[PDB]
């Protein structure tokens, strides 16, 4: 399978007093492994997965220096954007940035990306070729022009195809016992009468990793999409994910209905049926 390394950055201006709140989180696939929060006491990049603690003091110093530099870029950008959008000093505004790189199953560079948003809307993004930019609006046309002229994409591409994937491969190896372990969903069905004549069948998928999953109900071997209640996939809090799908059926007809579970940790999809 492919693997990704992604960094997510949020900075929020504080118009009443002080500088923006800045939060950075790094992920390998669906595993958080570092964080920085300008409101925390340490003022350090901090570990959030055991395998990143294999890195020595030079890593924490270097990532702290860089993440503070990232914070200052976001702070200045909030000022720039307030000007571009002719906004007052009194409002709070947000920048969000996500960048990262993927390796394929061949452990080589697969893709890289860098997306930026202002006040929860697309602003500018690096195109798939890692050489050009997409601007969402006319303000972002200014950034596209300036980043073209300053060859911002060229240093970004160098990182995405080089250092980014090199360190992703490092992390995947160091953390292989978890990062490259799939946790197939533990699946079960529950049955809840809602009347003497109707019952809810709920199909549960628990403790799975990664988060990508498909749960579907069928009746007589064809899809039963319209009648399914499907909750959004949600974190268990221990690094795994949860999901369920439910259907209401006539009592005594439960055997017609099947729950189908697709997950990359399964060699073949699972089929569950209430006896």
């Amino acid at each position: 399978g492919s693997h990704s390394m992604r960094y997510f950055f949020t900075s929020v201006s504080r118009p009443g007093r002080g500088e923006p709140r800045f939060i950075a989180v790094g992920y390998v696939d669906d595993t958080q492994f570092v964080r920085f929060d300008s409101d925390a006491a340490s003022q350090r990049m901090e570990p959030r997965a055991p395998w990143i603690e294999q890195e020595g003091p030079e890593y924490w110093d270097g990532e702290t220096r860089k993440v503070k530099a990232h914070s200052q870029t976001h702070r200045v950008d909030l000022g720039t954007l307030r000007g571009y959008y002719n906004q007052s000093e009194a409002g709070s505004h947000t920048v969000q940035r996500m960048y990262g790189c993927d390796v394929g199953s061949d452990w080589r560079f697969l893709r890289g990306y860098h997306q930026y948003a202002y006040d929860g809307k697309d602003y500018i993004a690096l195109k798939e070729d890692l050489r050009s930019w997409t601007a969402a609006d006319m303000a972002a046309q200014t950034t596209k022009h300036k980043w073209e002229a300053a060859h911002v994409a060229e240093q970004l591409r160098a990182y995405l195809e080089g250092t980014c994937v090199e360190w992703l491969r490092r992390y995947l190896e160091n953390g292989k016992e978890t990062l490259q372990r799939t946790d197939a969903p533990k699946t079960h069905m529950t049955h809840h009468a809602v009347s003497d004549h109707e019952a809810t069948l709920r199909c549960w998928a628990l403790s799975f990793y990664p988060a990508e999953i498909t749960l579907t109900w069928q009746r007589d071997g064809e899809d039963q999409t319209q009648d399914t209640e499907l909750v959004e996939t949600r974190p268990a809090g221990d690094g795994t994910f949860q999901k369920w799908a439910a259907v209401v059926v006539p009592s005594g007809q439960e055997q017609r209905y099947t729950c189908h579970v697709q997950h990359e940790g399964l060699p073949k999809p699972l089929t569950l049926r209430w006896e």
């Binding site: 860089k66 240093q155 970004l156 250092t163």
Partner: peptide, 11 residues
């Protein structure tokens, strides 16, 4: 590992 340098929108 983070990007070594993060250019602003406008320097």
């Amino acid at each position: 590992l983070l990007l070594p340098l993060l250019p602003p929108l406008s320097p």
